[PDB]
């Protein structure tokens, strides 16, 4: 009778077990142990769940581990059933949110404690990792919880929880990708760059899965960053009162006006306000997450370090493709070979649209630099570079100012664009070092230089090929010796004529354009 009275009194029994008295806790702990050994269903998963849903200190986790160790010698299949009971209580209307936040924290501490040491975790055959990985689809939506502590605990758990050795089903893979990107953006908004470690760890851990997961992570990560709800972090974007004030001009005479043009004044117009430190450091956090995701496996620890790990030319290709998708979805000029100059006068609407997109969100330029440090990648962004270049050509055709510093953004966009295409091994080093004169020229002069750039890309196209995969230190290299043009003859001639005009001011910088 004592055992099956405590069968339904186990709730208060374990509730007063966690008090850590002088000698009472050992007595009630053995009472729980003999209870869960005795009872015919089990009553061990419920006891383990109650010890896990209310543990707020390391020693009561320790008592939970002693309970499991005392139970594993007799019963079996305890931890999976305990986690089923816990997560079913979480997803139902019970287990009020401090309890589930605490439980997810205790689970994170336990499964992190497994993946360390070996004197203690190998003694208890708990297998917290496999049991936690079995419930991963049940555990992903907890990143979407309204309470911040539950979401933070779930983020820490999913950051530390190992994946199945079975690999991961694509539906729950995609769902984990959605949970990761949303948690990254939400923790970036709420806390900041301190507080995204769990989400970045989860995203960079399931980015190193099968490559479909890598493309999914990169795509959702850098199209969610350009969404309206998240682009503010990375840069940015009656009758009574009518009749009370109708005296004088009315009366027995007609009113003065004839109507209202629209609904009246067009608002009072909104003034956007940001601070640059948060902008630059959220950008730093996102580019750090991308450069972790787009990096190769590595893990060799060879040499004396001091080196640059490779960025994968396939991950940057995915980033380039989804960036082109986000900016210009059109397919009129999707060929990677540049058309003639006069053809730029046809698709001027698209060029203005890419110019507007680059002007509104600075992060696009930043992403181009990410595309830059993987030389087959920026070739896929030939449409974007062509459109932005054509917009800059239009601006310098329409410019009437004597000096190019009167338009800040267009000068910065031109110099940044040619610098990025010089990063991506598209232009020669001789011709790619021209932007340092752009700050002190005339608009027609920088126009002629950009037409020289356009003509060079006509003559030597930005094809995915013509890069050799040099294998001793395996990277793609474009060597400008063997194309037959080398440094652009007419192009460097025009650029040298540009220098030879403004000798008065381009004196010191004439040494950069010397022949190699």
């Amino acid at each position: 009778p004592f055992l099956d009275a405590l069968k339904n009194h186990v709730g208060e029994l374990c509730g007063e077990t966690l008090r850590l008295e002088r000698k009472r806790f050992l007595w009630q702990h053995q009472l729980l142990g003999l209870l869960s050994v005795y009872t015919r269903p089990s009553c061990g998963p419920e006891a383990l769940g109650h010890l896990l849903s209310r543990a707020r200190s390391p020693e009561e986790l320790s008592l939970a581990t002693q309970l499991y160790a005392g139970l594993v010698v007799s019963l079996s299949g305890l931890l999976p059933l305990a986690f089923r009971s816990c997560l079913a209580r979480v997803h139902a209307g019970t287990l009020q949110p401090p309890f589930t936040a605490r439980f997810l924290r205790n689970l994170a501490l336990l499964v992190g404690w497994e993946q360390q040491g070996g004197e203690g975790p190998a003694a208890l055959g708990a297998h917290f990792g496999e049991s936690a990985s079995a419930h991963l689809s049940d555990l992903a939506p907890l990143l979407l919880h309204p309470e911040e502590e539950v979401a933070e605990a779930a983020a820490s758990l999913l950051a530390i929880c190992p994946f199945p050795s079975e690999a991961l089903s694509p539906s729950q893979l995609l769902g984990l990708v959605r949970a990761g990107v949303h948690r990254f953006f939400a923790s970036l908004r709420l806390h900041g760059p301190p507080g995204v470690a769990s989400a970045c760890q989860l995203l960079t851990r399931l980015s190193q899965t099968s490559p479909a997961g890598l493309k999914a992570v990169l795509q959702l990560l850098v199209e969610g960053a350009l969404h309206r709800g998240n682009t503010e972090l990375f840069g940015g974007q009656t009758n009574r009162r009518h009749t009370a004030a109708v005296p004088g001009p009315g009366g027995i005479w007609s009113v003065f006006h004839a109507g209202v043009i629209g609904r009246g004044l067009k608002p009072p117009k909104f003034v956007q306000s940001r601070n640059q430190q948060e902008v630059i450091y959220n950008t730093q956090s996102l580019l750090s997450l991308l450069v972790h995701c787009c990096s190769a496996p590595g893990g060799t620890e060879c040499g004396e370090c001091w080196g640059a790990p490779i960025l994968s030319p396939e991950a940057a290709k995915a980033v380039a493709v989804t960036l082109v998708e986000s900016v210009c979805p059109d397919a009129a000029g999707a060929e990677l070979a540049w058309p003639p100059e006069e053809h730029a006068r046809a698709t001027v609407e698209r060029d203005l649209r890419i110019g507007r997109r680059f002007r509104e969100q600075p992060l696009l330029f930043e992403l181009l630099k990410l595309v830059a440090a993987a030389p087959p990648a920026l070739c896929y962004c030939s449409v974007l570079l062509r459109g932005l270049l054509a917009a800059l050509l239009g601006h310098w055709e329409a410019s009437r100012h004597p000096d190019t510093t009167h338009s800040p953004w267009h000068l910065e966009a031109s110099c940044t664009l040619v610098a990025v295409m010089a990063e991506g091994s598209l232009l020669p080093p001789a011709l790619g070092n021209m932007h340092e004169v752009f700050s002190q020229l005339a608009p027609f002069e920088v126009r002629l230089l950009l037409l020289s750039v356009w003509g060079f890309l006509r003559e030597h196209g930005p094809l995915p090929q013509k890069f050799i995969f040099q294998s001793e230190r395996g990277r793609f290299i474009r060597d400008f010796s063997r194309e037959g043009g080398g440094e652009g003859g007419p192009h460097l001639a025009v650029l040298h004529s540009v220098l030879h005009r403004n000798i008065d001011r381009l004196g010191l910088f004439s040494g950069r354009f010397q022949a190699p």
Binding site: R40, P41, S42, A88, R89, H91, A92, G93, T94
Partner: protein, 141 residues
């Protein structure tokens, strides 16, 4: 003592044959003297989310009859019913909606969250539960 071997078979059961045969036996001996289903609560919870259709239907019918004996235990099968309503097997959800209005009456304190989850499962997931939830509404008053 009279219920120990059947529940030992139910707990240590791997194949569909053993579970279905024990479920048939317990249904047969629960047609008369139907107060014996109080012991089969946790195992009926575990087997109610089983993927085979026949044993799942037997477990659901036994759970509903166990409510019919004493409705004070309907607050204990709630997490399993919520899990069956929101699982990814696409047959547990349909068997849950088939038994939705009866359990909606038999719970009557947590019917709001049950019907709420029914609407979101039928709304976000493309299926039509409107008849069952509306019938539960009309007989719930």
């Amino acid at each position: 003592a009279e219920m120990a071997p059947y529940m030992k078979r139910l707990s240590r059961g791997q194949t569909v044959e053993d579970l279905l045969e024990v479920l048939s036996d317990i249904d047969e001996m629960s047609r008369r003297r139907p107060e014996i289903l109080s012991f089969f609560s946790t195992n009926l919870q575990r087997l109610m989310s089983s993927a085979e259709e026949c044993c799942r239907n037997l477990a659901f019918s036994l759970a509903l009859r166990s409510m019919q004996n004493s409705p004070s235990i309907a607050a204990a099968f709630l997490p399993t019913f919520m899990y069956c309503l929101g699982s990814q097997d696409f047959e547990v959800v349909q068997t849950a909606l088939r038994n939705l209005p009866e359990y909606a009456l038999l719970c009557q304190e947590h019917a709001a969250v049950l019907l709420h989850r029914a609407f979101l499962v039928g709304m976000y997931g493309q299926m039509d539960p409107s008849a069952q939830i509306s019938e539960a509404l009309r007989i719930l008053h």
